């Protein structure tokens, strides 16, 4: 299936200090393999993944150096951002960025990604053509105006299509055993009384990788969408994920309901009930 690399960067300005806090985190197939924190004692990208240890000093050097560059970039942008939104002083602000590339089972590019956000909201994102921009609001327009004039897109476009793709292939080659692995989910159902004539049924899926998964409930046939609480997939802490789905079933009538779990490492959809 698909593969990807992402670099989630966060810069949070803060009063009384002119150095915003910068935290950059790289992921591969949505798995942390590198991190940088401006608040650490000696800032530098650190290996967050076992297969990332083989990288030599030259590597970490260049990477860290770039992070140093980003800090300035975020330090500045954050500043202009303050002016754009005629914001005041001694407040704390957040500017985030997501960068990266998606690949198909064939390791050939699918999408190029670049988009920023200010205060948790969309600000500006490079469109899928890797040529134009999309500004979330008025302010963002000025940045687009300037970014079109500088022709920045071509620069990011190059990265997204060359070095992003190329370096992902490598990490994938190195993280072979870790990344391209899959853990089938392990499901089970639980019972609880909810209302007077109703009952809560919870379909559990545990210890699976990758995170992506599909849990569905259905009345002896068609699927169910009413009063069906599906919890946000969460990390188990050991690298595998968990998730569950509940459905308000009328007491007594229960073996009539069934849930199916869909997942890569699954030879065929898990089906089960109470």
């Amino acid at each position: 299936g698909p593969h990807s690399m992402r670099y989630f960067e966060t810069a949070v300005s803060r009063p009384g200090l002119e150095e915003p806090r910068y935290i950059s985190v790289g992921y591969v197939d949505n798995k942390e393999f590198v991190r940088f924190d401006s608040d650490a004692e000696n800032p530098r990208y650190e290996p967050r993944a076992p297969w990332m240890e083989q990288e030599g000093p030259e590597y970490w050097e260049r990477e860290t150096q770039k992070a140093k560059g980003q800090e300035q970039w975020f330090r500045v942008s954050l500043r202009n951002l303050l002016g754009y939104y005629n914001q005041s002083a001694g407040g704390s602000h957040t500017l985030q960025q997501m960068s990266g590339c998606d690949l198909g089972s064939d390791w050939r590019l699918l999408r190029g990604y670049l988009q920023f956000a200010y205060e948790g909201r969309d600000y500006i994102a490079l469109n899928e053509d890797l040529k134009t921009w999309t500004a979330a609001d008025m302010a963002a327009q000025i940045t687009r105006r300037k970014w079109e004039q500088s022709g920045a897109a071509e620069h990011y476009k190059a990265y997204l299509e060359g070095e992003c793709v190329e370096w992902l292939h490598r990490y994938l080659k190195n993280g072979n055993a870790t990344l391209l692995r899959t853990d089938s989910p392990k499901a089970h159902v639980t019972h609880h009384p909810r209302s007077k004539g109703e009952v809560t049924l919870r379909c559990w899926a545990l210890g699976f990788y990758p995170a992506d998964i599909t849990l569905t409930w259905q009345l002896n046939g068609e699927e169910l969408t009413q009063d069906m609480e599906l919890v946000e997939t969460r990390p188990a802490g050991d690298g595998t994920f968990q998730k569950w789905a509940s459905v308000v079933v009328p007491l007594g009538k229960e073996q009539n309901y069934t849930c199916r779990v869909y997942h890569e490492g699954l030879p065929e959809p898990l089906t089960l009930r109470w």
Binding site: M5, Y7, S24, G26, V34, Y45, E63, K66, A67, G69, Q70, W73, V76, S77, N80, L81, Y84, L95, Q97, S99, L114, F116, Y123, I124, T143, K146, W147, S150, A152, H155, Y156, Y159, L160, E163, C164, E166, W167
Partner: peptide, 9 residues
């Protein structure tokens, strides 16, 4: 392999 934005916001 991190990216490097050069034109500021």
């Amino acid at each position: 392999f991190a990216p490097g934005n050069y034109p500021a916001l």
